[PDB]
Design a protein around this ligand. Sequence first.
Ligand SMILES: *[C@@H]1O[C@H](CO)[C@@H](O[C@@H]2O[C@H](CO)[C@@H](O[C@@H]3O[C@H](CO)[C@@H](O)[C@H](O[C@H]4O[C@H](CO)[C@@H](O)[C@H](O)[C@@H]4O)[C@@H]3O)[C@H](O)[C@H]2NC(C)=O)[C@H](O)[C@H]1NC(C)=O
Ligand SMILES: *[C@@H]1O[C@H](CO)[C@@H](O[C@@H]2O[C@H](CO)[C@@H](O[C@@H]3O[C@H](CO)[C@@H](O)[C@H](O)[C@@H]3O)[C@H](O)[C@H]2NC(C)=O)[C@H](O)[C@H]1NC(C)=O
Ligand SMILES: *[C@@H]1O[C@H](CO)[C@@H](O[C@@H]2O[C@H](CO)[C@@H](O)[C@H](O)[C@H]2NC(C)=O)[C@H](O)[C@H]1NC(C)=O
Ligand SMILES: *[C@@H]1O[C@H](CO)[C@@H](O[C@@H]2O[C@H](CO)[C@@H](O)[C@H](O)[C@H]2NC(C)=O)[C@H](O)[C@H]1NC(C)=O
Ligand SMILES: *[C@@H]1O[C@H](CO)[C@@H](O[C@@H]2O[C@H](CO)[C@@H](O)[C@H](O)[C@H]2NC(C)=O)[C@H](O)[C@H]1NC(C)=O
Ligand SMILES: *[C@@H]1O[C@H](CO)[C@@H](O[C@@H]2O[C@H](CO)[C@@H](O)[C@H](O)[C@H]2NC(C)=O)[C@H](O)[C@H]1NC(C)=O
Ligand SMILES: CCCCC/C=C\C/C=C\CCCCCCCC(=O)O
Ligand SMILES: CCCCC/C=C\C/C=C\CCCCCCCC(=O)O
Ligand SMILES: *[C@@H]1O[C@H](CO)[C@@H](O)[C@H](O)[C@H]1NC(C)=O
Ligand SMILES: *[C@@H]1O[C@H](CO)[C@@H](O)[C@H](O)[C@H]1NC(C)=O
Ligand SMILES: *[C@@H]1O[C@H](CO)[C@@H](O)[C@H](O)[C@H]1NC(C)=O
Ligand SMILES: *[C@@H]1O[C@H](CO)[C@@H](O)[C@H](O)[C@H]1NC(C)=O
Lengths: 236, 291, 49, 48, 49
Amino acid sequence: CLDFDDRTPPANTQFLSSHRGVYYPDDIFRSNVLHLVQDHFLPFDSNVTRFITFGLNFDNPIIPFKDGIYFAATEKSNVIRGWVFGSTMNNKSQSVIIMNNSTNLVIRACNFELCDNPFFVVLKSNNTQIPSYIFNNAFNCTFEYVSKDFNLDLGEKPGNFKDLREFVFRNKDGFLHVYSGYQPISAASGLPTGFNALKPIFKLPLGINITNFRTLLTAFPWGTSAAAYFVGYLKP
Amino acid sequence: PSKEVVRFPNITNLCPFGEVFNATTFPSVYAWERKRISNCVADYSVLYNSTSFSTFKCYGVSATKLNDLCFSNVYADSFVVKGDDVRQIAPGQTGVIADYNYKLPDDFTGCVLAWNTRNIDATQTGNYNYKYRSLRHGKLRPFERDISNVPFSPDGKPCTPPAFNCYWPLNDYGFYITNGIGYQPYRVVVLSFELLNAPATVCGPKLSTDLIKNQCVNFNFNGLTGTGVLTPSSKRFQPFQQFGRDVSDFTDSVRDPKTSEILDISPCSFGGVSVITPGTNTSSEVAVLYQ
Amino acid sequence: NSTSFSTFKCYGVSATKLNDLCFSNVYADSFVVKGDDVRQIAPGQTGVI
Amino acid sequence: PTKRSFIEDLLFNKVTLADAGFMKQYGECLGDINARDLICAQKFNGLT
Amino acid sequence: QALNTLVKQLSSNFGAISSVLNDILSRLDKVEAEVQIDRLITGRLQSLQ
Ligand SMILES: *[C@@H]1O[C@H](CO)[C@@H](O[C@@H]2O[C@H](CO)[C@@H](O[C@@H]3O[C@H](CO)[C@@H](O)[C@H](O[C@H]4O[C@H](CO)[C@@H](O)[C@H](O)[C@@H]4O)[C@@H]3O)[C@H](O)[C@H]2NC(C)=O)[C@H](O)[C@H]1NC(C)=O
Ligand SMILES: *[C@@H]1O[C@H](CO)[C@@H](O[C@@H]2O[C@H](CO)[C@@H](O[C@@H]3O[C@H](CO)[C@@H](O)[C@H](O)[C@@H]3O)[C@H](O)[C@H]2NC(C)=O)[C@H](O)[C@H]1NC(C)=O
Ligand SMILES: *[C@@H]1O[C@H](CO)[C@@H](O[C@@H]2O[C@H](CO)[C@@H](O)[C@H](O)[C@H]2NC(C)=O)[C@H](O)[C@H]1NC(C)=O
Ligand SMILES: *[C@@H]1O[C@H](CO)[C@@H](O[C@@H]2O[C@H](CO)[C@@H](O)[C@H](O)[C@H]2NC(C)=O)[C@H](O)[C@H]1NC(C)=O
Ligand SMILES: *[C@@H]1O[C@H](CO)[C@@H](O[C@@H]2O[C@H](CO)[C@@H](O)[C@H](O)[C@H]2NC(C)=O)[C@H](O)[C@H]1NC(C)=O
Ligand SMILES: *[C@@H]1O[C@H](CO)[C@@H](O[C@@H]2O[C@H](CO)[C@@H](O)[C@H](O)[C@H]2NC(C)=O)[C@H](O)[C@H]1NC(C)=O
Ligand SMILES: CCCCC/C=C\C/C=C\CCCCCCCC(=O)O
Ligand SMILES: CCCCC/C=C\C/C=C\CCCCCCCC(=O)O
Ligand SMILES: *[C@@H]1O[C@H](CO)[C@@H](O)[C@H](O)[C@H]1NC(C)=O
Ligand SMILES: *[C@@H]1O[C@H](CO)[C@@H](O)[C@H](O)[C@H]1NC(C)=O
Ligand SMILES: *[C@@H]1O[C@H](CO)[C@@H](O)[C@H](O)[C@H]1NC(C)=O
Ligand SMILES: *[C@@H]1O[C@H](CO)[C@@H](O)[C@H](O)[C@H]1NC(C)=O
């Protein structure tokens, strides 16, 4: 049970993607060959809606999920730590959440009582994470998965954005395909120009009419650090 | 060809055929479940002794070839329907079950099983423990679930159940012992898998052999048959790919299930030969020229 | 809501496309047969029925 | 060395033939596969 | 160029499930795979002609 009273209008800044956002189509090794494929890809030089924090803009809104999205987040500090996918985001329709809470990675899918304002609280005094509330009940369940243990640095960094992490999500035939990729970057604006291939990392067997998506942000106490994530829709 | 190089992964555990096909409780159609299958020796001969399937018909693969092939990404669904609704579980069908409860994809690589269970899922009085949806907006997408229980109205406005044009979308299956073949419980198990595309960890009992290299052999790598010469390679395979392909669709590189090591496959026949003859009338001797 | 059909299989059109298509000159026949004679109602079959 | 004159050698040097060696042995097409030579791919399919 | 085109024309599904054999023969029995084999043979013979 938490909420924010102070609000700031979303920026909703539109930028351009420099022909980035491709992924491996199939699990077949091919070398020294030019292959022609037809699938859902991000169009070259297309709009990307950016959402920016640390400017008193704790956005965390709902974004439509039409034929998949391309999630590219640039951040020098771990402010974005997962997503939540659902139809109505209430406790009347099943939703799947993926949170990068430390010492594991959690994927769970169940009739979740969303708090309407996801939260992840960590104080800058000791750089230690304290418990937060993303949901209040669980009700009926249908998936679960806990990964291995790792620790991500919560220490705040004063420098500009240091790493780029891009993901691609697609729901087809009851499977949520996830592709991951990461490349170093040093800039403070727009989306780095370049090329990068995304490798398959997940195929989650959950049957949900996934139509809306919302990210999970981390706040350093009202207010947070600098982190920008871009959303791009794929088209056939 | 001379020898056989059949090679299968290191699987030494029998598949769970009692957890499924012999589960104490089976879910309803409107809320079905899924189970992941891995590290199995899929021999359906063990089911010959206990379970008899009234309908075992499926697509994307031949029934007789299920013992040699190797499948990947195997999942098993389970639900309970009546006699007349057991024909709706098939690609390209219409009905209450095939629209609002469980829809199969148009293209489907898997197997569907179903048997009759009257002595277990029926009583002298009504069972009324299995439910299904009959009122819904639109149609379900293939392999999707809808477990929400909200009042349904033709207009779409939320409403209380006692109001007009407001019904509960879930009805109860009334199973009695004194019923015909129709309206009788039928437990259905649907299996889906993908083969010869990704690395696999589940298939039937085929005894692997040793590796034969630099010789025309009849290999069998995870169900992929053919004749060729196996040669050590230099390509580097990423951990999510197993086979390789050329500019023309043909497998040239296959990762060894056991002893991961990338092997090259080449055609056995290569070259050219011509025959020189002075004429049959003159002599029967010939001269052979190899290019 | 009312009737359950033990056999609903037919030809010349796809079952899933019956909601978008528009038919003309529709006629309906009706009769009563036994269980073993219900398979004889099909194009290219032999039997008493 | 060559039995051709200077002009004929110049003419032969201009044309960049695909250089079908007319003897592509099984050893050459079985090794050095990373080059992906077109001729080795054609002779594997019965085109000579 | 003609020979290279003929080589690269071997990866076309001439109405069959797959363009590469030993895959149709491994997933289907003798009777069912014969149709796809005949389709591939017809397509490749047309290419040769
Ligand atoms: C998964 O969730 C999605 C997203 O919510 C859902 O798809 C559709 O959601 C939209 C948005 O809520 C609905 O579409 C419209 O909704 C309103 C409210 O009814 C109306 O504008 C429309 O309904 C009327 O449409 C026609 C009138 O023009 C008439 O047929 C009649 O009057 C309808 O009331 C319209 O539906 C929509 O309700 C749902 N989809 C459906 C099929 O109803 C979807 O249900 C989920 N997807 C899956 C695959 O289960
Ligand atoms: C999804 O969650 C809902 C809500 O919890 C489940 O519905 C509820 O299921 C329980 C049993 O798990 C029902 O309790 C039992 O119901 C009847 C009498 O109504 C009787 O068998 C028992 O005395 C007991 O009370 C409960 O009524 C039912 N409804 C509500 C509103 O709570 C639902 O089953 C879950 N679905 C799945 C697929 O798990
Ligand atoms: C996002 O795409 C929209 C498409 O409407 C662009 O917004 C307008 O596009 C029209 C049509 O080309 C132009 O005439 C307007 O000038 C655009 N408005 C603005 C404010 O630029 C929009 O530019 C795109 N976003 C980008 C390119 O970042
Ligand atoms: C689904 O969520 C709603 C909204 O939170 C829950 O409604 C609550 O119902 C209880 C009584 O059951 C009331 O005391 C609360 O005030 C309600 N909350 C709100 C915000 O109005 C509803 O119970 C939930 N359904 C469940 C848990 O099955
Ligand atoms: C991150 O999430 C995991 C999964 O829920 C948490 O690990 C579990 O913690 C509970 C605490 O009651 C234990 O009962 C479980 O056995 C743990 N699961 C394991 C170890 O697999 C973990 O605590 C979370 N991290 C936090 C809260 O900092
Ligand atoms: C599958 O089992 C075989 C059994 O031979 C394994 O091969 C042995 O691997 C060990 C190391 O794990 C070596 O020391 C032996 O020399 C190998 N023996 C032979 C005959 O090759 C093989 O590694 C196993 N594969 C996997 C993936 O576990
Ligand atoms: C009498 C009016 C005839 C109108 C003809 C035009 C279209 C009719 C087509 C289909 C009607 C019957 C569909 C089968 C319903 C199956 C229900 C079930 O399987 O449970
Ligand atoms: C024993 C003599 C066998 C002779 C073989 C030559 C021809 C036989 C062919 C068909 C015989 C049986 C026809 C089926 C009759 C169906 C009657 C029904 O469906 O009601
Ligand atoms: C750091 O500060 C937090 C927050 O006050 C406190 O809980 C914790 O004990 C402190 N020490 C360490 C070692 O984390
Ligand atoms: C299958 O179920 C029957 C009861 O229906 C039980 O007696 C038998 O032991 C089971 N067989 C197994 C689990 O192999
Ligand atoms: C097969 O079933 C019979 C009874 O029909 C039983 O005695 C026997 O033990 C069973 N064998 C196996 C291998 O399950
Ligand atoms: C559907 O059938 C139920 C009983 O099963 C009945 O109460 C209801 O009125 C029927 N609805 C319609 C629209 O015919």
